[PDB]
Amino acid sequence: TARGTPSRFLASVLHNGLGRYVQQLQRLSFSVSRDGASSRGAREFVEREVIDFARRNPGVVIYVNSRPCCVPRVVAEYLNGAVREESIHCKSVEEISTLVQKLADQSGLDVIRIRKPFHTDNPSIQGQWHPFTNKPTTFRGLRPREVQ
Amino acid sequence: AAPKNRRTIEVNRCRRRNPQKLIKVKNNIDVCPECGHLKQKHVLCAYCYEKVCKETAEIRRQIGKQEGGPFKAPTIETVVLYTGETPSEQDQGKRIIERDRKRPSWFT
Amino acid sequence: SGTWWDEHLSEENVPFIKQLVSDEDKAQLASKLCPLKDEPWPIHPWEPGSFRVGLIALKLGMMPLWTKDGQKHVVTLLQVQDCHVLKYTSKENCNGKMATLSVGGKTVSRFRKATSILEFYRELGLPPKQTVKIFNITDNAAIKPGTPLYAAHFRPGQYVDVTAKTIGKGFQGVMKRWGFKGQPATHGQTKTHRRPGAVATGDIGRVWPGTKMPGKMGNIYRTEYGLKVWRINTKHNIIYVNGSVPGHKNCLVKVKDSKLPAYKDLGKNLPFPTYFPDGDEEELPEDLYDENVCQPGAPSITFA
Amino acid sequence: ISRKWEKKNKIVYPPQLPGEPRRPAEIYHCRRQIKYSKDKMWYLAKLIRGMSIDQALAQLEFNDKKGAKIIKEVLLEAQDMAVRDHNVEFRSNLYIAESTSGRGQCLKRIRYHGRGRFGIMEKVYCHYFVKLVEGPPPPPEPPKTAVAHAKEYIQQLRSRTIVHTL
Amino acid sequence: SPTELTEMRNDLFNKEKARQLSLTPRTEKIEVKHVGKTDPGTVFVMNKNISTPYSCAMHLSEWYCRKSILALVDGQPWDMYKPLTKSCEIKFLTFKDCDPGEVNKAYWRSCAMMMGCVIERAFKDEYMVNLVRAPEVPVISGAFCYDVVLDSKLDEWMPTKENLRSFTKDAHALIYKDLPFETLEVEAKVALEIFQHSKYKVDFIEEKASQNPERIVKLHRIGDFIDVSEGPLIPRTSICFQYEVSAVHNLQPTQPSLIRRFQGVSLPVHLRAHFTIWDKLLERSRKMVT
Amino acid sequence: ISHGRVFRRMGLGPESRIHLLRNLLTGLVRHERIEAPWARVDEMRGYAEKLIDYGKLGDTNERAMRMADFWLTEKDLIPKLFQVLAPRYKDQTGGYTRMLQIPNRSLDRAKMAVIEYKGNCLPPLPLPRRDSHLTLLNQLLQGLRQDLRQSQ
RNA sequence: ACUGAACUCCUCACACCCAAUUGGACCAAUCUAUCACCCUAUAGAAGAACUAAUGUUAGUAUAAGUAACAUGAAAACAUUCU
Ligand SMILES: [Mg+2]
Ligand SMILES: [Mg+2]
Ligand SMILES: [Mg+2]
Ligand SMILES: [Mg+2]
Ligand SMILES: [Mg+2]
Ligand SMILES: [Mg+2]
Ligand SMILES: [Mg+2]
Ligand SMILES: [Mg+2]
Ligand SMILES: [Mg+2]
Ligand SMILES: [Mg+2]
Ligand SMILES: [Mg+2]
Ligand SMILES: [Mg+2]
Ligand SMILES: [Mg+2]
Ligand SMILES: [Mg+2]
Ligand SMILES: [Mg+2]
Ligand SMILES: [Mg+2]
Ligand SMILES: [Mg+2]
Ligand SMILES: [Mg+2]
Ligand SMILES: [Zn+2]
Incomplete structure (x- = not known):
């Protein structure tokens, strides 16, 4: 709930799109197990997708750990320095693939309420309204009920 | 009559912690120039008073020894005397009470 | 820490300070006994619609007074003690229809007064007064501050209004405050003898404001209207007024001319700005009496 | 029961570099299981809450309440140990940092009413806690001036944005 | 120029103080016994040239520090903030003492000092202000006084009542600052380096150096202002609660050089008077005192 | 409502009131100095002073004997009243008793006063003493006094 | 003419607003079989889930620091007095 939670204004890291687009996902850390059903879905993700995924985005460094665990996870790290942990657990190759894509195309800015949808650094061109726009001028700048 | 609803902590905290129900600071405290203990002004020094009352307690004990029984209050005046002092000419003809110690500085 | 004036004075200095300040109040009273001689304000003759x-005054006590028709009228005695003019405020500044004169009462100690008040009285050149009351006056009635006032200010035959704080009866019950009847003493009547009855009607889910119920009684200002002045003693400055006056004895009352419609234009012959004894136009006798008053030391009354 | 407050005197900080402000000394002390109501004790705790040691001892001396002598004892004990063990130079330069009363463990007895009815009466106990900080006591925050009110009001008007636009 | 002169004197004061501090080998423990009526036989084991009567007081209670105005060291008046030298007997002196003779003398000596301080910085630079001294005056006399030589330009000039109220508020400001009266005892020479600009201070220093077998003289500093004093002073400025500069009087045989005796009266915080009584005391201080 | 009510109600009634006061007075006569609750000391104080005046009347006065008989329960104190206390206060016309406020009672937290007859044999009470004439303020006031006397 | 819905259109998404009742898709924790081995998997079992019964036990609040309760006096603490 909006009152019950924090808010941010819409932004990017370092005006991302302005010059050149930079992928914000920097590091990916996959924890899988050799045995055990939880890591099964993830196991075959490392059989096929990992390799071609890593080719697709050379910016991301991928680390696969392969140690005993009851819950396999993925640690997404971003340029700005945010860390996002996601438990892949008992998920099919396809829905794991969707996750890894979703991580790779987002920034490190936190997911809370985003206030205004639009953000301008120069909102006006002609000049912001003030109460002395579209109000006429007087001879010698005289106020009403002036003596002279 | 009976309360219709429980009073909350905030309501109660306003009752209890207002300056009216608080303890007020006393501003009439001073140092006893005699003994250096703390006394309230307008009141006798607690230390100094104890000191007097312990002396007067012992004097009353010596009064009992000499009087020796109830209903024997004398028809003369009284004077108290310490070690190495003598009654004067005007002291003659009044009740004498002796002591085994020196006269206090404060008692003259 | 709080300090009173005696804290740091030896036994030698105490009588000295006491006598010194006593001298100075006497000196300050001495200075102002000649108002007309000292540069005064213009004195205007009385015209209709004017208020002085x-x-x-201090209420001394009460006494009987007799009239020629043989009737007995109780009088209250009012002593004018160290009465002076304090401050004049114009009609503009006071934000009223009338201009205003401040009058001081019983002389009081400097040691028990507030800093600013002591400063105010220093500027005047008078010792501090106990009570201050404001009088609504017309422009012509203006009196230079510092001018003393005397009981001969009023004359017999004149009606006055008297206001003072009533006698304080503290928290009282409904029965003595509002004269509620209360409940019977016998025939049952369990623990109800002096209780207020039903407070309100059941239909209304409240109690109407300003309902009569037990509370703090007395100790409030009340005025008595149209009290005749039977007698003036000029030496002691005693006003003798008809009937009862509010407040205890040795209390301070505010006494001015009556407001009542019957005596609206009766101020013609009454000494307008004030009575000035220093004027020496005619030296007022020991006592002043009303026509009807039986004189103390006059022959026994016959109805023949 | 928890006894954290006692252990607070066993904290050792590592030695300071010469280029450092002198750390104030720090003493925690308490009394447990005082036969007195915790809320009644609060008023006395609250009273001495920010004052220097001596000034608190003065205020407590002439105070008529039962717990007042108890607190006096605790304060004198605390002052003594501050000088002796906590390496405080002067006994006078201490002020009460925090003064708190807690609920101690209580017993239940019976109260006999009319008919056969009864109630459960509680023998009330409480703890008192104190903390002493070496140095002069903190000067109280000054009352808010008209200029401060004005200053902040200006700040407040300047913070307005046109809302629900770009 | 005076603004540089004042800070120069400070630097000189500071360097001498630092020199006197440095010749002390670490810390030597002196023993000081309390010979007071109250709390007897107390022995304070103090630092040799560091610890003060104030430090002893603040071993005892705040009641001492609050209500201690002077010290007796071997029965000699001693500043509260003066560092000790050797083992001795110490007792403290208050205003409400039986014989506050020494205490009263010290109080007036200090008030006169701060009056001189405020007078100096009350006039603009185009005029010349020259402080000469504060003469020793019995407390039973009207008020304390400081003697001043002003510019020849201000020969006709007499201060108005508003000017007096001006000085009043100015001295009050000094009290509010609450400045300790730092003391320093030195040989004559270094003090002459401090005061060589005003001859009226030069000769006064020479007087004190001659009268004493040693060339020891006392210099009391109130924050920035340094002044030569004839004896011990009050610890802090806060001690004063009432302080009005009453009047200025011209001395009669002053055809060669005009002398203006500034007079004012003061009461400490412990002994404060009612409004009316203080007023009558001001009246007396308006009279010229000799 | 109770303006100008002089006596304060004390015991379990007016009879008891007198009886408590009489006990206090009896004590004070005998011992010459007594600690009691502040209200009761103040209340009894007046009757103590009034007793000395009756004592001043002498043994020969039959009225005074009857009064002393009532107010002193010990009957051995009556000689003391008339042959010790009355002679002692020969010079003074009034002011025989002094009363002071001392620290509150421990048990009760009651206001406590000591009352004593003046010029007794006992060690003297620590009494409030005004500051010395040599104080700074007193010296300045003495200064003002000097001005006024020497002006004329 | 304008304003004016969850009606209708628009960019995307779609099982995602009836009582009793009836049908269906999942699932917390626990034990067992076999896995797993920083807390899981597939099944088999079951005392398998509490915002409510003037529910039952324990703890702490509200009323509330409320109502209420209590020690004849002085003293040498011998004694005396009411
Ligand atoms: Mg009736
Ligand atoms: Mg019944
Ligand atoms: Mg009845
Ligand atoms: Mg029964
Ligand atoms: Mg309970
Ligand atoms: Mg009673
Ligand atoms: Mg719409
Ligand atoms: Mg629809
Ligand atoms: Mg739909
Ligand atoms: Mg399962
Ligand atoms: Mg179940
Ligand atoms: Mg539950
Ligand atoms: Mg019920
Ligand atoms: Mg219920
Ligand atoms: Mg339930
Ligand atoms: Mg409670
Ligand atoms: Mg209630
Ligand atoms: Mg009750
Ligand atoms: Zn004492």
């Missing part, structure tokens, strides 16, 4: 200043 009043006095501050």
Whole structure:
């Protein structure tokens, strides 16, 4: 709930799109197990997708750990320095693939309420309204009920 | 009559912690120039008073020894005397009470 | 820490300070006994619609007074003690229809007064007064501050209004405050003898404001209207007024001319700005009496 | 029961570099299981809450309440140990940092009413806690001036944005 | 120029103080016994040239520090903030003492000092202000006084009542600052380096150096202002609660050089008077005192 | 409502009131100095002073004997009243008793006063003493006094 | 003419607003079989889930620091007095 939670204004890291687009996902850390059903879905993700995924985005460094665990996870790290942990657990190759894509195309800015949808650094061109726009001028700048 | 609803902590905290129900600071405290203990002004020094009352307690004990029984209050005046002092000419003809110690500085 | 004036004075200095300040109050009273001689304000003759200043008097006590028709009228005695003019405020500044004169009462100690008040009285050149009351006056009635006032300010035959704080009866029950009947003493009546009855109607889910119920009684200002002045003693400055006056004995009352419609234009012959004894136009006798009053030391009354 | 407050005197900080402000000394002390109501004790705790040691001892001396002598004892004990063990130079330069009363463990007895009815009466106990900080006591925050009110009001008007636009 | 002169004197004061501090080998423990009526036989084991009567007081209670105005060291008046030298007997002196003779003398000596301080910085630079001294005056006399030589330009000039109220508020400001009266005892020479600009201070220093077998003289500093004093002073400025500069009087045989005796009266915080009584005391201080 | 009510109600009634006061007075006569609750000391104080005046009347006065008989329960104190206390206060016309406020009672937290007859044999009470004439303020006031006397 | 819905259109998404009742898709924790081995998997079992019964036990609040309760006096603490 909006009152019950924090808010941010819409932004990017370092005006991302302005010059050149930079992928914000920097590091990916996959924890899988050799045995055990939880890591099964993830196991075959490392059989096929990992390799071609890593080719697709050379910016991301991928680390696969392969140690005993009851819950396999993925640690997404971003340029700005945010860390996002996601438990892949008992998920099919396809829905794991969707996750890894979703991580790779987002920034490190936190997911809370985003206030205004639009953000301008120069909102006006002609000049912001003030109460002395579209109000006429007087001879010698005289106020009403002036003596002279 | 009976309360219709429980009073909350905030309501109660306003009752209890207002300056009216608080303890007020006393501003009439001073140092006893005699003994250096703390006394309230307008009141006798607690230390100094104890000191007097312990002396007067012992004097009353010596009064009992000499009087020796109830209903024997004398028809003369009284004077108290310490070690190495003598009654004067005007002291003659009044009740004498002796002591085994020196006269206090404060008692003259 | 709080300090009173005696904290740091030896036994030698105490009587000295006491006598010194006593001297100075006497000196300050001495200075101002000649108002007309000292550069005064213009004195205007009386015209209709004019209101003059009043006095501050102390209630001494009560006495009987007799009239020629043989009737007995109780009088209250009012002593005018160290009554002076304090401050004049114009009609503009006071934000009123009338201009205003401040009058002081019983002389009081400097040691028990507030800093600013002591400063105010220093500027005047008078010792501090106990009570202050404001009188609504017309422009012509203006009196230069510092001018003393006397009981001969009023004359017999004149009606006055008297206001003072009533006698304080503290928290009282409904029965003595509002004269509620209360409940019977016998025939049952369990623990209800002096209780207020039903407070309100059941239909209304409240109690109407300003309902009569037990509370703090007395100790409030009340005025008595149209009290005749039977007698003036000029030496002691005693006003003798008809009937009862509010407040205890040795209290300070505010006494001015009556407001009542019957006596609206009766101020013609009454000494307008104030009575000035220093004027020496005619030296007022020991006592002043009303026509009807039986004189103390006059022959026994016959109805023949 | 928890006894954290006692252990607070066993904290050792590592030695300071010469280029450092002198750390104030720090003493925690308490009394447990005082036969007195915790809320009644609060008023006395609250009273001495920010004052220097001596000034608190003065205020407590002439105070008529039962717990007042108890607190006096605790304060004198605390002052003594501050000088002796906590390496405080002067006994006078201490002020009460925090003064708190807690609920101690309580017993239940019976109260006999009319008919056969009864109630459960509680023998009330409480703890008192104190903390002493070496140095002069903190000067109280000054009352808010008209200029401060004005200053902040200006700040407040300047913070307005046109809302629900770009 | 005076603004540089004042800070120069400070630097000189500071360097001498630092020199006197440095010749002390670490810390030597002196023993000081309390010979007071109250709390007897107390022995304070103090630092040799560091610890003060104030430090002893603040071993005892705040009641001492609050209500201690002077010290007796071997029965000699001693500043509260003066560092000790050797083992001795110490007792403290208050205003409400039986014989506050020494205490009263010290109080007036200090008030006169701060009056001189405020007078100096009350006039603009185009005029010349020259402080000469504060003469020793019995407390039973009207008020304390400081003697001043002003510019020849201000020969006709007499201060108005508003000017007096001006000085009043100015001295009050000094009290509010609450400045300790730092003391320093030195040989004559270094003090002459401090005061060589005003001859009226030069000769006064020479007087004190001659009268004493040693060339020891006392210099009391109130924050920035340094002044030569004839004896011990009050610890802090806060001690004063009432302080009005009453009048200025011209001395009669002053055809060669005009002398203006500034007079004012003061009361400490412990002994404060009612409004009316203080007023009558001001009246007396308006009279010229000799 | 109770303006100008002089006596304060004390015991379990007016009879008891007198009886408590009489006990206090009896004590004070005998011992010459007594600690009691502040209200009761103040209340009894007046009757103590009034007793000395009756004592001043002498043994020969039959009225005074009857009064002393009632107010002193010990009957051995009556000689003391008339042959010790009355002679002692020969010079003074009034002011025989002094009363002071001392620290509150421990048990009760009651206001406590000591009352004593003046010029007794006992060690003297620590009494409030005004500051010395040599104080700074007193010296300045003495200064003002000097001005006024020497002006004329 | 304008304003004016969850009606209708628009960019995307779609099982995602009836009582009793009836049908269906999942699932917390626990034990067992076999896995797993920083807390899981597939099944088999079951005392398998509490915002409510003037529910039952324990703890702490509200009323509330409320109502209420209590020690004849002085003293040498011998004694005396009411
Ligand atoms: Mg009736
Ligand atoms: Mg019944
Ligand atoms: Mg009845
Ligand atoms: Mg029964
Ligand atoms: Mg309970
Ligand atoms: Mg009673
Ligand atoms: Mg719409
Ligand atoms: Mg629809
Ligand atoms: Mg739909
Ligand atoms: Mg399962
Ligand atoms: Mg179940
Ligand atoms: Mg539950
Ligand atoms: Mg019920
Ligand atoms: Mg219920
Ligand atoms: Mg339930
Ligand atoms: Mg409670
Ligand atoms: Mg209630
Ligand atoms: Mg009750
Ligand atoms: Zn004492």
